[PDB]
């Protein structure tokens, strides 16, 4: 053919390659921020050379990330112009494509800048209602929002899907008018592998939320309660399951927000788990047939065994009544009791077998 399916291949490769460097430069800044935040508490201070040197490596990565995002959007514009018949870049701007670019820029543009700035922080302590005031730095405000950079992982995972760039899949979708969207992958995954995504999401949320809670609570905790990493892990775990708080109520609002988010996520995951358990218990045809066969055999055997005793007790009663002159009534009444028990057992087994048979028909 030429051009088409030859040039379109190059655009796909360029778009796919540009989404990995962005992820690398997005994770590098997060890692450096975590190390700097951990080491700036006791190892050194904010007025040293280590802090400036280690925070000057975040701005460069942010600039590279912004450049990569802009190039990615330009290549997407080129692909859109190639796909639909058009010869002007101005046609794509539709008051919605512009907004998401600005949203991405604002989300990925936040980082702790070099310097030494401070502000005043006041909070009310739990279980005692006592005021507390400290002097904090503005870097804590500018570092937590950088966890929003995790949306790139979804894009990288989607662009690498085999069911996204397969010609046969496209042909079948055309034959069935299937809408291959960014959400259909989740719908398929919640069926093919419904027990792996839940575990991965739970562990990631657990670790990130515990670290964030401890980072908030370091400032106003002097008794090592909510500022301990294992304590934060336990608090997140018990809030996820909605058991309670114990004596681990935070003294800060950003801990309360994390706890509320964890509770909402836990409720949603519990509903999903209930649905999955309901869906995972029904039997297939083969095992059902085998079960019916074995049950029918067992019930037939039990029916014969129960039917023997009725005749046995009848014969015992008849032999013991009109024979050997005098009769001992104790044996007679015992045999009558056994006869009634045998009758009831036979009736019950017959009813159960007929019910099972009509159900299995």
């Amino acid at each position: 053919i030429g051009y088409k399916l030859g040039h379109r291949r190059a655009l796909f490769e360029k778009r796919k390659r540009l989404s990995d460097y962005a992820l690398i430069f997005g994770m590098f800044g997060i890692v450096v921020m975590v190390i700097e935040t951990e080491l700036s508490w006791g190892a050194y201070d904010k007025a040293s050379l280590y802090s400036l040197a280690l925070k000057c490596l975040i701005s460069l990565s942010t600039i590279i990330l912004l450049g990569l995002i802009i190039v990615y959007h330009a290549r997407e514009i080129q692909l859109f112009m190639v796909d639909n018949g058009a010869d002007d870049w101005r046609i794509a701007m539709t008051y919605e494509r512009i907004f998401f670019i600005c949203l991405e820029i604002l989300v990925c543009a936040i980082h702790p800048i070099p310097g030494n700035y401070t502000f005043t922080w006041t909070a009310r302590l739990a279980f005692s209602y006592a005021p507390s005031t400290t002097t904090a730095d503005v870097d804590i405000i500018l570092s937590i929002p950088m966890f929003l950079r995790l949306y790139l992982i979804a894009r990288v995972m989607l662009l690498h899907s085999k069911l996204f760039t397969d010609a046969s899949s496209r042909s079948i979708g055309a034959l069935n008018k299937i809408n291959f969207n960014t959400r259909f992958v989740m719908k398929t995954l919640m069926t093919i592998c419904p027990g792996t995504v839940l575990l991965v999401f739970s562990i990631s949320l657990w670790i990130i939320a515990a670290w964030t809670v401890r980072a908030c609570e370091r400032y106003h905790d002097q008794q090592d309660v909510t500022s301990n990493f294992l304590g934060a892990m336990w608090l997140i775990s018990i809030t996820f399951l909605s058991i309670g708080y114990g004596d681990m109520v935070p003294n800060t609002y950003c801990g309360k927000g994390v706890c509320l988010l964890t509770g909402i996520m836990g409720a949603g995951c519990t509903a999903l788990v209930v649905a999955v358990v309901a869906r995972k218990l029904e039997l297939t045809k083969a095992e059902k047939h085998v079960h019916n066969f074995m049950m029918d055999t067992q019930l037939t055997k039990r029916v014969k065994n129960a039917a023997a005793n009725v005749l046995r007790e009848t014969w015992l009663i008849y032999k013991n009544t009109k024979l050997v002159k005098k009769i001992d009534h104790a044996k007679v009444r015992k045999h009558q009791r056994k006869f009634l028990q045998a009758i009831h057992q036979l009736r019950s087994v017959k009813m159960e077998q007929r019910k099972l048979n009509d159900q299995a028909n």
Partner: protein
């Protein structure tokens, strides 16, 4: 006691569920109508045999005095002289009814409480009402003589 006036309408109300339009009789066509609505599709012989037993008059249909007697036995928690037949029909082949005498020997040795050989040896005595080795229910009615 017998049956009081308020009890008269009680049975007629139940009798009206089988008497559709003042028929006064219980025929095969009406019986098949109610059975389909109860999840049953029996054969013609089954319903023919069912009405045959309760046809005391001989006109080929069920009457109210006949209906009263048959339903009275159904009120009992256990019909004593009916389960013995059911046990016999469990050990029955092709509806003949003539159970082989030698067959009873095996079933009493192991199936159940395992009666002794001498016990069934006396059991087979007087079991042969004639001396061939086949009994349909003459042993059963002999059991419930008194």
């Amino acid at each position: 006691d017998q049956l009081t006036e308020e009890q008269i309408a009680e049975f007629k109300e139940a009798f009206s569920l089988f008497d559709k339009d003042g028929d006064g009789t219980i025929t095969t066509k009406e019986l098949g109508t109610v059975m389909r609505s109860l999840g049953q599709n029996p054969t013609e012989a089954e319903l023919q045999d069912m009405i045959n037993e309760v046809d005391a008059d001989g006109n080929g249909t069920i009457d109210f005095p006949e209906f009263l007697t048959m339903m009275a036995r159904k009120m009992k928690d256990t019909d004593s002289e009916e389960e013995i037949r059911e046990a016999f029909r469990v050990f029955d082949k092709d509806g003949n009814g003539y159970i082989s005498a030698a067959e009873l020997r095996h079933v009493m040795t192991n199936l159940g409480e395992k009666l002794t050989d001498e016990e069934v040896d006396e059991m087979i005595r007087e079991a042969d009402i004639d001396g061939d080795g086949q009994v349909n229910y003459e042993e059963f009615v002999q059991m419930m003589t008194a």
